[PDB]
Amino acid sequence: ATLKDQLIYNLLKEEQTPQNKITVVGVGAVGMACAISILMKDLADELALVDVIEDKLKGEMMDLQHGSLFLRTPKIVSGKDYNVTANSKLVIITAGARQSRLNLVQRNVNIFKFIIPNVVKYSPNCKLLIVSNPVDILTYVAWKISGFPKNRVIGSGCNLDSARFRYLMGERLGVHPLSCHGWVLGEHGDSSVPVWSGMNVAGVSLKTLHPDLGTDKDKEQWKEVHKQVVESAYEVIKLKGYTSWAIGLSVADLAESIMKNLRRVHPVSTMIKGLYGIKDDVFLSVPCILGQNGISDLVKVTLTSEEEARLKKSADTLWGIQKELQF
Amino acid sequence: ATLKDQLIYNLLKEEQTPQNKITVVGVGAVGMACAISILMKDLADELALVDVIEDKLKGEMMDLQHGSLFLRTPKIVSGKDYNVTANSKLVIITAGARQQSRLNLVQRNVNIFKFIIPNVVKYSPNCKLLIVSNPVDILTYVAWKISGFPKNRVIGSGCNLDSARFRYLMGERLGVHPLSCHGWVLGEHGDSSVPVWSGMNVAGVSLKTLHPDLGTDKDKEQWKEVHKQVVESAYEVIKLKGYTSWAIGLSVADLAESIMKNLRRVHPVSTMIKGLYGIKDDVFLSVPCILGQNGISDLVKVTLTSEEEARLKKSADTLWGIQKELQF
Amino acid sequence: ATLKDQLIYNLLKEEQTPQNKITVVGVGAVGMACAISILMKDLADELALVDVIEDKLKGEMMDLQHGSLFLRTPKIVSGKDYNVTANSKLVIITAGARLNLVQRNVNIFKFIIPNVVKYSPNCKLLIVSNPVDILTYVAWKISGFPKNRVIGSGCNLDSARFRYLMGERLGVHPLSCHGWVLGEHGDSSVPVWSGMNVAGVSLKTLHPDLGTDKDKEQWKEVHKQVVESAYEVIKLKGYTSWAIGLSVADLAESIMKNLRRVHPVSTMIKGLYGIKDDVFLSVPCILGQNGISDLVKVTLTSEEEARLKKSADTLWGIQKELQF
Amino acid sequence: ATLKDQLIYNLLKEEQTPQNKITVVGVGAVGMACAISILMKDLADELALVDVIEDKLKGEMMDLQHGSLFLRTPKIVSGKDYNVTANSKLVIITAGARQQEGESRLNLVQRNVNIFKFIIPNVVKYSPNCKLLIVSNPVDILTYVAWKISGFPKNRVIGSGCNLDSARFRYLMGERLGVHPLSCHGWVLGEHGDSSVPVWSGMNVAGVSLKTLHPDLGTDKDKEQWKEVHKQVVESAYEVIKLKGYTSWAIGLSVADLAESIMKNLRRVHPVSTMIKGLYGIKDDVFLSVPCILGQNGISDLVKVTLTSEEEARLKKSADTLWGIQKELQF
Numbered sequence A: 001a002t003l004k005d006q007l008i009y010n011l012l013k014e015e016q017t018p019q020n021k022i023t024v025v026g027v028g029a030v031g032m033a034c035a036i037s038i039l040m041k042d043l044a045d046e047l048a049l050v051d052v053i054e055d056k057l058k059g060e061m062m063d064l065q066h067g068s069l070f071l072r073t074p075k076i077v078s079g080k081d082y083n084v085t086a087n088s089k090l091v092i093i094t095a096g097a098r099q100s101r102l103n104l105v106q107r108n109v110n111i112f113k114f115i116i117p118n119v120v121k122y123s124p125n126c127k128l129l130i131v132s133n134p135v136d137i138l139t140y141v142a143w144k145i146s147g148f149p150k151n152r153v154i155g156s157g158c159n160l161d162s163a164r165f166r167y168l169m170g171e172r173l174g175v176h177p178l179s180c181h182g183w184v185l186g187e188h189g190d191s192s193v194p195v196w197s198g199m200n201v202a203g204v205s206l207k208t209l210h211p212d213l214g215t216d217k218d219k220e221q222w223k224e225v226h227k228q229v230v231e232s233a234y235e236v237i238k239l240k241g242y243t244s245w246a247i248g249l250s251v252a253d254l255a256e257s258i259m260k261n262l263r264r265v266h267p268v269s270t271m272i273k274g275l276y277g278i279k280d281d282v283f284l285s286v287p288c289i290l291g292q293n294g295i296s297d298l299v300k301v302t303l304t305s306e307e308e309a310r311l312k313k314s315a316d317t318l319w320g321i322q323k324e325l326q327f
Numbered sequence B: 001a002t003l004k005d006q007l008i009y010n011l012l013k014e015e016q017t018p019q020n021k022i023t024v025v026g027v028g029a030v031g032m033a034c035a036i037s038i039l040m041k042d043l044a045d046e047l048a049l050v051d052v053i054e055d056k057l058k059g060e061m062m063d064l065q066h067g068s069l070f071l072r073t074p075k076i077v078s079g080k081d082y083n084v085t086a087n088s089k090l091v092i093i094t095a096g097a098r099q100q101s102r103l104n105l106v107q108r109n110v111n112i113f114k115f116i117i118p119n120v121v122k123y124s125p126n127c128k129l130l131i132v133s134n135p136v137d138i139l140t141y142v143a144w145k146i147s148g149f150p151k152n153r154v155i156g157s158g159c160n161l162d163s164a165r166f167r168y169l170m171g172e173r174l175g176v177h178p179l180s181c182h183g184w185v186l187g188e189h190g191d192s193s194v195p196v197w198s199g200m201n202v203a204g205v206s207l208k209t210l211h212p213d214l215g216t217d218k219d220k221e222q223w224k225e226v227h228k229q230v231v232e233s234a235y236e237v238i239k240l241k242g243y244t245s246w247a248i249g250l251s252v253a254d255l256a257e258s259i260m261k262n263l264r265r266v267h268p269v270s271t272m273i274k275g276l277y278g279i280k281d282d283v284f285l286s287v288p289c290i291l292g293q294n295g296i297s298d299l300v301k302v303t304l305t306s307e308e309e310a311r312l313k314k315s316a317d318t319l320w321g322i323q324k325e326l327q328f
Numbered sequence C: 001a002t003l004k005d006q007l008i009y010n011l012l013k014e015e016q017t018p019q020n021k022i023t024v025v026g027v028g029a030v031g032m033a034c035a036i037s038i039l040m041k042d043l044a045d046e047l048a049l050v051d052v053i054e055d056k057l058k059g060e061m062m063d064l065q066h067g068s069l070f071l072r073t074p075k076i077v078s079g080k081d082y083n084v085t086a087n088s089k090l091v092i093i094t095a096g097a098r099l100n101l102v103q104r105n106v107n108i109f110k111f112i113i114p115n116v117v118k119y120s121p122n123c124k125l126l127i128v129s130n131p132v133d134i135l136t137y138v139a140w141k142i143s144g145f146p147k148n149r150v151i152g153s154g155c156n157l158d159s160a161r162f163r164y165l166m167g168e169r170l171g172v173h174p175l176s177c178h179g180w181v182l183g184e185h186g187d188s189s190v191p192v193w194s195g196m197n198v199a200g201v202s203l204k205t206l207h208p209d210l211g212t213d214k215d216k217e218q219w220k221e222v223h224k225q226v227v228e229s230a231y232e233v234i235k236l237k238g239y240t241s242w243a244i245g246l247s248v249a250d251l252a253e254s255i256m257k258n259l260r261r262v263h264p265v266s267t268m269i270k271g272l273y274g275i276k277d278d279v280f281l282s283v284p285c286i287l288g289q290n291g292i293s294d295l296v297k298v299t300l301t302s303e304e305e306a307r308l309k310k311s312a313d314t315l316w317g318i319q320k321e322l323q324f
Numbered sequence D: 001a002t003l004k005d006q007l008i009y010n011l012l013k014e015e016q017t018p019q020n021k022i023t024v025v026g027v028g029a030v031g032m033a034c035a036i037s038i039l040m041k042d043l044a045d046e047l048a049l050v051d052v053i054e055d056k057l058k059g060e061m062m063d064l065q066h067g068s069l070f071l072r073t074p075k076i077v078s079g080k081d082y083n084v085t086a087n088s089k090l091v092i093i094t095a096g097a098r099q100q101e102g103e104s105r106l107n108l109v110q111r112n113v114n115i116f117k118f119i120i121p122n123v124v125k126y127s128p129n130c131k132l133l134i135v136s137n138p139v140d141i142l143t144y145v146a147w148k149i150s151g152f153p154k155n156r157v158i159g160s161g162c163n164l165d166s167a168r169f170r171y172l173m174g175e176r177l178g179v180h181p182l183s184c185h186g187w188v189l190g191e192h193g194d195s196s197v198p199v200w201s202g203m204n205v206a207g208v209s210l211k212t213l214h215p216d217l218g219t220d221k222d223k224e225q226w227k228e229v230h231k232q233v234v235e236s237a238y239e240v241i242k243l244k245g246y247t248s249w250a251i252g253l254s255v256a257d258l259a260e261s262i263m264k265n266l267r268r269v270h271p272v273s274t275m276i277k278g279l280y281g282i283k284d285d286v287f288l289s290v291p292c293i294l295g296q297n298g299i300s301d302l303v304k305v306t307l308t309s310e311e312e313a314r315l316k317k318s319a320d321t322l323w324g325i326q327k328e329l330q331f
């Protein structure tokens, strides 16, 4: 017999559906950062990568595979064909077209019209995590095309924005970001909302201590912290050409909550119809409880009139683009 | 009174000297893969990054800082000046020209090291140096020569990755996790490495004993191709994606783990091998080394076949021929 | 509207089942060591504890629950009733007393195993209770499970102790010290000298007296120290707990994560080494999501084979008289 | 030539002083749960255990050591002699006196002082720059005692205080709200035990204040009786004691979380016991739990929580009581 048969006696060839599988779609900088972070946090028992550039895809797969001795994810697969993604619990979408606003979103619609039905065909029960920008519109697109219930379509939304905010808050106060609490909500990008009323260390509200916090009268101009959050991508892109590591870590944190059913609260993009006077089918970031069935619950943050008006404006602008899209 | 001062009462401002600081020199694809892997393994209380391309260096630093909420490394710094590297326990050198002859690669990397190593030694006189830049066996010798450090504190990444690839391919053939598939690739990193067939085993069961033709031309199952693929796999990845990063980053982070936590695990890394295998020259090659907080404290003396010994000797001869002409 | 409703808008409520549930049966020193080790390795989304002492059981559950902020296991439950164990992927049996011992632990298993099978029909069973090789056989017979899903902790800890002791002698971390103790867990275990190595260098080839009474360094006494270790620890602190907990958690990891790592655990060895009886002994097994999918056929000396066969004859002698 | 020397060539015979060493004093149920948790979190390159019962001590060491293959802490040592503790970064004290029934509270504390008169000077002799983490009860008073005996600056003397109390509170809150305790924020401060103070104003999920949504929160007229959450926090230990005989696992995990912040210099905020003179009208040398920034120098900073009048009066009454006991102690 073979050396394998001389060395190993088989009790059963009988294999099983992979039980904790993750797919990442897109193997650019963002997708590969998501992949390595997922691998180093031992979240999946099988990882699949899909992209349309076949050589790059195979090379990235192989490079990860060659690290297998130092990982605990025993199977890594890839291919242009979505059959490699079958029975994924979670599918992370990072592919898309990069930038006209309506035309750009329509180009990503046409891309998602190929990707999403493929994903659904092979993992009809998966959760979808949309990272591709503009994430709030593209989470809607994914939801529309998939037919999935709202709970199973999640946008990375303001998760990273909020992490950057807490990083920056930590530097100002000299405290680890883990102990600096603060939420950036709404539309990911220039119109996101820093919720001053919820910023705290050890349950001590900064706004109560410093009533002018986040206003034009603030002697310390904490508004600049939010400006830095919305500028951060630009600044990093100007310096290294793209952003990758921070988004990969933040996405892995979201995957952890879903795959381990933790029901931690994260600021991610979900369908907000019914809240803040919004009546259109639009997705925006609010704090959501994340777990095994995706977004089961959301936190009803108390917002001021101005903060609600900002979320409503974003919603109006997003709906205006969305009604003009062709599915 | 500022918000910070209303919120927080300071007890003292004293000291602040990093206890488990790691520096990565060179923030190319390799250096950054090393950095992310080290960060996600919680090996350091401070990570410093150094490079000559200041915009890229700053951008990478910022990108890592922006993920601090998800990490347990509270301080990440960078700069072109080596003062950012002060008091490092471990300095990882992943700086150099990225290749694509091998002699011209030596030429330029020796010049870069002539600048880098004195600066590293100035600010971290007590560090361990881990050399990844290629050709790693030569550049490990070079870093040793320049630094003046004792042998134990100058470590080349050597065949650690070659071995990890071998174990992955073995595990694929056998349907066993690479952790349970043992085998060692030693000697000169890359094209001339040597697989030690006699040590290949699962659960202490020697494959060579079961299958006497293993590694020879008579082998009907062509296990020699597994080592051949360790070489061919690498060039294949370069053809497909243009470089390799993740596997080398993970391998380097494993070495950093053994050193930082003083584990005294055995790794095939590149060390000063004068006194073994008839080798009488100051050559660095990979053998199994015990790694801990003093770097390479001991090495294992592997019994090699005549053929295996002759391949290590030929490498040592070649390397010394190159090294003996170097001008410091 | 309650405070909860004021704070949280529900999208949907239907209850889900755990994806990675582990049950630990018996909350003595061993059970709880396994449970804390399993919790700190983030292997489970639900942990179930079962025992017959209701006060102690509730107390241990609560004590773990109070640490939840520091863990990644969102639900910990306990109960005398096996309904709390339903849908388990892995069930670890540590219940029983620390001829006489076997019979007492068999009667316990006549109650435990059917209840386990009833609520988690597709689980892997990991038997830790002693004598582990016999009670693994008992679990298999009673359960009706195929043999890949009935696993004894076996010599996994014996081999871990051996590698610790080898590592102390050589000044090398046990991770890089390789050596296997096989066969019957306890007094009659077999140290496989031919497989002992560092970096693939055979100690036996380097030191031909290795394992014999002629050995001036008395490496044979390293195996004796393994056999006597539990006795020495039990003498000092009254029981052993931590090492077994950590070794059980390592097995759990390989199973839950489908790693296909090789571990020396107790499996049906009929058909190997001339053994004809339905006896379980430790050999290196590939462990994954179907339990033991494969085993490594270690090449043993004629002496080593005779030892395994003698253990098999002795175990069957006990097993044949057992009343199910 | 020994087998070892035939197999291994030695470049240098070692040995560095330990670099990330932790000592646990007391190998009872609490000390050992601290030890296992510290080991499974890879916080130390060397762990020392010290206690006076030599047999039990040796047995616990050997049992841990037999799990070495599964750990990443290469040196585990123990001894009755404190020379095994030399050069520890962090020394965790869990040793103490068991209460006798009917005993005055002063009397119990004094018996613990008598134990600390042996332990603390031994700790200081062999690790004079360490951080001391006091776990032994009553923790707030015994942290004061360790401070006085050691002569250490206050930043290096830390009581485990209300770290566990707050974690229980967040566990209970999370069960009520259907949210992981990591995302349920709330602080129990002051004196560990029956007189702790639940700071209702800081209780929140995602920055949304429960007190602002539900003004009755924590009061007697609250129809959801949220004050019972804090009642369960204060009675948790008693109920676990009654049920299983003692508590261990929760305190082990909480101490390991404190050790992580100190050893990795994280500057995370924890409610631990610190010398609080000069706050809340407290004018005595007493230790109470407030949110503290923990790192490699121990407590570098504290958070100044805005308290209500009744909250402030509760801390002051604790300080007065603690002080009244402390000024009677014989050092």
Ligand SMILES: NC(=O)C1=CN([C@@H]2O[C@H](COP(=O)(O)OP(=O)(O)OC[C@H]3O[C@@H](n4cnc5c(N)ncnc54)[C@H](O)[C@@H]3O)[C@@H](O)[C@H]2O)C=CC1
Pocket: A025, A026, A027, A028, A029, A030, A031, A050, A051, A052, A053, A094, A095, A096, A097, A098, A111, A114, A115, A131, A132, A133, A134, A135, A156, A157, A160, A188, A242, A243, A247
């Ligand atoms: N919402 C958020 O928080 C953030 C989102 N992103 C998103 O992640 C995306 C990825 O950016 P990078 O990785 O830097 O780009 P990149 O240029 O490094 O790589 C993107 C990859 O996507 C692939 N791709 C394009 N269309 C595809 C299709 N139909 N199917 C499969 N693969 C396809 C390309 O072949 C390319 O390799 C960005 O376009 C952005 O939209 C990035 C950062 C933050």
Ligand SMILES: NC(=O)C1=CN([C@@H]2O[C@H](COP(=O)(O)OP(=O)(O)OC[C@H]3O[C@@H](n4cnc5c(N)ncnc54)[C@H](O)[C@@H]3O)[C@@H](O)[C@H]2O)C=CC1
Pocket: B025, B026, B027, B028, B029, B030, B031, B050, B051, B052, B053, B094, B095, B096, B097, B098, B099, B112, B115, B116, B132, B133, B134, B136, B157, B158, B161, B189, B243, B244, B248
């Ligand atoms: N031995 C091994 O297993 C492996 C070795 N390598 C080696 O690592 C090195 C880097 O590879 P890549 O990251 O792809 O190269 P890269 O071109 O992607 O980046 C290398 C970095 O070195 C920097 N650098 C140049 N001179 C410097 C100086 N004086 N100080 C500090 N930084 C300086 C460059 O600015 C650049 O950012 C190469 O020598 C490569 O052969 C790479 C993979 C595996």
Ligand SMILES: NC(=O)C1=CN([C@@H]2O[C@H](COP(=O)(O)OP(=O)(O)OC[C@H]3O[C@@H](n4cnc5c(N)ncnc54)[C@H](O)[C@@H]3O)[C@@H](O)[C@H]2O)C=CC1
Pocket: C025, C026, C027, C028, C029, C030, C031, C050, C051, C052, C053, C094, C095, C096, C097, C098, C108, C111, C112, C128, C129, C130, C131, C132, C153, C154, C157, C185, C239, C240, C241, C244
């Ligand atoms: N195979 C191995 O490597 C090792 C095995 N062990 C074995 O583990 C077993 C338990 O050891 P310890 O935890 O120290 O004993 P212990 O007495 O501390 O705990 C045993 C528990 O089993 C419970 N129990 C009894 N009947 C039960 C039933 N019908 N259902 C559920 N629970 C029941 C008891 O109430 C008790 O809580 C013993 O057989 C011991 O020999 C111990 C160490 C290593």
Ligand SMILES: NC(=O)C1=CN([C@@H]2O[C@H](COP(=O)(O)OP(=O)(O)OC[C@H]3O[C@@H](n4cnc5c(N)ncnc54)[C@H](O)[C@@H]3O)[C@@H](O)[C@H]2O)C=CC1
Pocket: D025, D026, D027, D028, D029, D030, D031, D050, D051, D052, D053, D094, D095, D096, D097, D098, D115, D118, D119, D135, D136, D137, D138, D139, D160, D161, D164, D192, D246, D247, D251
């Ligand atoms: N602050 C907190 O949250 C908690 C504190 N604790 C405290 O931890 C301590 C230990 O509790 P357990 O481990 O359950 O009690 P235990 O009695 O089981 O263990 C305490 C150990 O202290 C030792 N000891 C006594 N005098 C000593 C000396 N001079 N040197 C060294 N060791 C000495 C004993 O030999 C014993 O092994 C108690 O004092 C208790 O008050 C316990 C639970 C929670």
Ligand SMILES: O=C1O[C@]2(CCc3ccccc32)CC(O)=C1Sc1ccccc1Cl
Pocket: B030, B098, B099, B134, B161, B162, B165, B189, B190, B191, B230, B231, B232, B234, B235, B238, B242, B243, B244, B245
């Ligand atoms: O896999 C690798 O990537 C290498 C090959 C050349 C190159 C260029 C950019 C980044 C990385 C790499 C460096 C290396 O040494 C290795 S390892 C190797 C190389 C050649 C033959 C065998 C091996 Cl194991």
